[PDB]
Amino acid sequence: FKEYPAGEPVTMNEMELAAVYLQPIDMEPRGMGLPAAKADVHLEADIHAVEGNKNGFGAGEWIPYLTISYTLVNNDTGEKQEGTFMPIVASDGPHYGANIKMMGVGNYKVTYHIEPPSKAGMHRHTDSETGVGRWWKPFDVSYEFKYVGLNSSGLVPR
Amino acid sequence: MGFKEYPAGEPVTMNEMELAAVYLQPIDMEPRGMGLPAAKADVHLEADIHAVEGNKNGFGAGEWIPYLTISYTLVNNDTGEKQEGTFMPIVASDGPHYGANIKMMGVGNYKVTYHIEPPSKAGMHRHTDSETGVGRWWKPFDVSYEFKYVGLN
Numbered sequence: 001f002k003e004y005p006a007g008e009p010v011t012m013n014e015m016e017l018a019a020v021y022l023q024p025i026d027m028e029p030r031g032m033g034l035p036a037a038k039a040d041v042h043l044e045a046d047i048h049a050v051e052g053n054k055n056g057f058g059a060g061e062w063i064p065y066l067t068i069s070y071t072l073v074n075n076d077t078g079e080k081q082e083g084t085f086m087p088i089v090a091s092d093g094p095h096y097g098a099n100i101k102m103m104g105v106g107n108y109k110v111t112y113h114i115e116p117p118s119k120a121g122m123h124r125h126t127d128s129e130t131g132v133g134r135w136w137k138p139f140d141v142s143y144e145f146k147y148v149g150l151n152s153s154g155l156v157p158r
Numbered sequence: 159m160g161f162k163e164y165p166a167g168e169p170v171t172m173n174e175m176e177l178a179a180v181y182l183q184p185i186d187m188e189p190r191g192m193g194l195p196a197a198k199a200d201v202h203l204e205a206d207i208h209a210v211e212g213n214k215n216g217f218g219a220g221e222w223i224p225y226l227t228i229s230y231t232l233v234n235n236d237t238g239e240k241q242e243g244t245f246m247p248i249v250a251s252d253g254p255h256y257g258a259n260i261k262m263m264g265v266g267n268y269k270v271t272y273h274i275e276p277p278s279k280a281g282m283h284r285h286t287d288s289e290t291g292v293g294r295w296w297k298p299f300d301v302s303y304e305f306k307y308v309g310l311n
């Protein structure tokens with residue numbers, strides 16, 4: 001299952017945030033996201049702390065409890081799609097993502113709208129000895145990538 | 159130098175996770191509203207849960223297990239009194255954990271049981287493909303810890 005980068009990684013709020021896509025992936029449970037057979041790609045957000053993180057995460061650690069929605073735009077046509085990622089585990093670890101129905105060939109921009117763990121129920125110590133400070137404000141990161149589809153082998157045509 | 163934290167019982171390793179229990183002084187948490195404020199509690203009780211080597215649910219050794227749903231049953235064996243509650247996911251300076259501020263039920267020998275439900279209950283999904291997939295979650299299960307509580311300190 002071949003992975004393709006979407007744009008360039010960005011470092012923001014002491015996290016590294018990358019976007020990747022691959023062929024649609026069957027997931028359990030069912031009912032929240034689009035089924036694989038009804039999608040064109042599986043789109044992911046890879047998000048991990050970097051050194052100096054002030055919210056309690058060590059370098060390289062996954063950031064859990066994020067709420068992440070996406071705005072996908074095919075800039076060739078102007079077509080826009082809104083959706084929301086789920087937290088997902090795979091053999092190479094936890095991430096966020098969704099199966100997506102794409103909008104044809106084009107130069108795309110995808111924006112990930114990211115809310116901090118407080119919005120999904122994660123609390124924080126506030127004592128002087130073990131406390132951490134307030135969360136960063138919800139923020140956006142965007143990726144620009146050229147999309148032509150994936151073929152029956154799950155590969156980008158050459 | 160020693161951190162003021164009191165182990166509750168002994169760690170156990172089940173379902174390819176190491177599960178430990180500790181308590182400390184009540185801790186004020188944000189956001190406010192959910193759960194007992196520190197002023198109305200006697201201890202802050204924690205669940206310390208990380209994968210061990212060989213975990214098949216996608217977590218590397220030592221990694222925090224996120225998206226668990228954990229409830230507790232606390233019994234003072236000296237008086238018979240029981241309390242049931244839930245833990246919250248929490249981050250502190252040394253990382254994510256689960257816990258709650260607790261009003262205790264007097265000095266005594268206690269048992270605390272953690273009922274643990276897998277990340278699927280709180281919305282975590284899994285790839286099921288041949289290449290990157292992980293299999294079914296384990297079923298909900300109980301772990302318990304016995305400790306002598308005399309107050310702090």
Ligand SMILES: [Cu+2]
Pocket residue numbers: 025042044088090095096097098285
């Ligand atoms: Cu995925």
Ligand SMILES: [Cu+2]
Pocket residue numbers: 112113114139140
């Ligand atoms: Cu936004």
Ligand SMILES: [Cu+2]
Pocket residue numbers: 125185202203204248250255256257258
């Ligand atoms: Cu805590």
